[PDB]
């Protein structure tokens, strides 16, 4: 009988993993603060990593990678991409970004040749086109967010000239195998895209909730992979694998192999896995760009069952075995 605890009840993904674990008859749930656990589905902030791996007679495993926040915060992601020699020169897949503070000179250096280059020049935080229209926006927020070149020419779906981003779910196990879930999701804009003015906002960024017209073309603004591949075949005479998926796999592999020395638990007294959510957007040249990396992602409703079973199969039962694969292994 393996034992586990649950310390983030707001987790849609790991609430389902708990029931899957309980329905095995070989996993018993304990109280949050019971230290005698095999597995920890830990909290999101201030996870006590320093308390793991000091229980004699217990192999301990955690659903988070200590240090993975350097990839999952917009500020540190930008800093990691510019400073790491593994990325900076040949980072054609990350949009030019700069870290701003509300209390820069490098940021204006590019926007001043944009001012004397006569090309598109809209950036993003919550968008504007003039530099100081967001500089005032920054100093009143009181926190820190990145400035980021906005993609003026995105790939638009037909019918309806719609914008979209792609969400890929990636599972990294205790051996630092990188498992890409074969099912992604396109989060669409159920509104036609408008380049004229950025004051009308709820058509530019395709948040699954900021679409509070809606569900016109597909349910919940979710287009899954089989149809988008079929659309790419019909419209563009190409496949999702060749036009987009090769770059997505390259970006995921690149980002995770970079921080591998800093977060690996290979010879550590406790072990780590983590489910990530990579957010991409594609321009009209079928070029993939990385938006953000979410360290505590939520799955689409159709895939909660299949993905959470895979988390148990690959990341949990591999360490704690009990009495065809849905993942694509990214080699390294």
């Amino acid at each position: 009988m393996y034992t586990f605890v649950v310390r983030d009840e707001n987790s849609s993904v790991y609430a389902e993993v708990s029931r899957l674990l309980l329905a095995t008859g070989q996993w018993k749930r304990l109280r949050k603060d019971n230290p005698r656990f095999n597995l920890m589905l830990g909290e999101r902030n201030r996870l006590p990593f320093g308390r793991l791996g000091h229980e004699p007679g217990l192999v301990q495993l955690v659903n988070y990678y200590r240090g993975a926040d350097k990839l999952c915060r917009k500020a540190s992601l930008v800093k990691l991409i510019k400073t790491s020699p593994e990325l900076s020169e040949s980072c054609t897949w990350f949009p030019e970004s700069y870290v701003i503070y509300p209390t820069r000179e490098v940021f204006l250096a590019a926007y001043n040749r944009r001012r004397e280059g006569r090309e598109g020049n809209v950036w993003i935080a919550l968008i504007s086109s003039e530099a100081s229209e967001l500089l005032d926006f920054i100093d009143e927020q009181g926190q820190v967010h990145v400035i980021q070149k906005y993609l003026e020419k995105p790939l638009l779906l037909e019918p309806g000239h719609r914008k979209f981003d792609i969400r890929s779910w990636v599972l990294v196990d205790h051996l630092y195998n990188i498992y890409l879930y074969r099912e992604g999701v396109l989060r669409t804009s159920s509104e036609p895209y408008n380049s004229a003015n950025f004051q009308d906002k709820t058509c530019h960024l395709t948040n699954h909730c900021i679409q509070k017209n809606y569900g016109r073309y597909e349910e919940g603004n979710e287009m899954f992979f089989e149809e988008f591949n079929q659309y790419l075949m019909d419209a563009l005479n190409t496949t999702l694998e060749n036009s987009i998926l090769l770059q997505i796999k390259h970006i995921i592999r690149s980002c995770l192999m970079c921080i591998e020395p800093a977060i690996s638990t290979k010879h550590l007294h406790y072990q780590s896995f983590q489910l990530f959510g990579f957010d991409f957007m594609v321009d009209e040249e079928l070029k993939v760009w990385l938006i953000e990396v979410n360290g505590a992602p939520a799955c689409a409703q159709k895939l909660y069952a299949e993905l959470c079973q895979g988390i148990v199969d690959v990341a949990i039962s591999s360490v704690f075995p009990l009495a065809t694969s849905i993942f694509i292994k990214l080699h390294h």
Binding site: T3, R31, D33, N34, P35, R36, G57
Partner: protein, 427 residues
Amino acid sequence: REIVHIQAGQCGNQIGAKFWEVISDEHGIDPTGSYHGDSDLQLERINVYYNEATGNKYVPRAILVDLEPGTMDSVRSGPFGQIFRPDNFVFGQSGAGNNWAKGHYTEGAELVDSVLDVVRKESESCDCLQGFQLTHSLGGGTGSGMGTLLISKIREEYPDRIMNTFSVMPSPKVSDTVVEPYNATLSVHQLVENTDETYCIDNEALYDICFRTLKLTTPTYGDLNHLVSATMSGVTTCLRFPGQLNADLRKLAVNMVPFPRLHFFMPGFAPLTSRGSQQYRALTVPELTQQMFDSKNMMAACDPRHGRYLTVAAIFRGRMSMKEVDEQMLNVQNKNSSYFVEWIPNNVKTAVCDIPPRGLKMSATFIGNSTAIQELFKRISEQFTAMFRRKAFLHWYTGEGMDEMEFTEAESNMNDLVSEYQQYQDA
């Protein structure tokens, strides 16, 4: 670090005599007090329980107390009877009549100073006396009433020493008289205040183990005392043989007792064996661990799954893998973690001794401070109240000078102890 042993009353002297028989055999001492054993480990810590006499004889640091001579003449005529110092036999003649008041206030008051004189003479011979251990029952008169009077007076003269008792709890299944709940309730009031460690040996548990497990249809006191002596040998293993801990009474009290009143331990033993019958199959370390935590091996009739463990001490005896002992002990805590309070980290301690007891190739002794011991006191409290509500049999006590108020106060202190054990069961 010497211990002074005291046995009081019929039960206290009968289990006390059995204790001295068993450990004398373990240390290679013969009924005459001469050491004809083979191992130097049998004498390294014989200082704890034996005084050295002229001619290199070993004399138990034991004091034998009773208000009537019948049982103590039976001890002198017994197998190991001549090993005791004759001056340490301190007896009256009037008896106690199974009356706590006679032992505590009247008949015992006549004799108590003569006992304390022998305690003082044994204490002055001690290099560094660490404390006292008492064997007695709580349902009678002498061991119950005079035993607790002795404990109060010993604490008065040795306030910084450890007081440890082996207290036999009464049960209607093994019952001499109807006033046993009265004597036990008055005694528990004394034990809560004036002892640091009390092994609760429930005659109900001893009967059930003899009946159901040991397959004895009508067990005697001699069959019950076989279980007591084997348990007393195990809980004193660390005192009598060298180990990694350098164990003593105070360190046990410090580590087992998180709150001074909750010091009533559940003893346990494995494997469970009857007299004459001999084990043939030695137990696996996994079997030793499973049985020692079994409710059916507990010497207090309480269900451990009805409470939680504050602390546990376990002592393994024999030649075995200390790695296997560590994994099996960790296995019980990890697989039953809900039954160990989470606010006392690492509350199970394990000791291993190489020399096994007579007859067994390996054994295991369990000592638990569980909140389930409240079931024992609740049982006594029920039988107490079923009579006190009608003031039944009280004239035996008011005739010796006691007031009803003392019964009410003793009932309230034990009911307080029950709710205090319940306080920590939900935490």
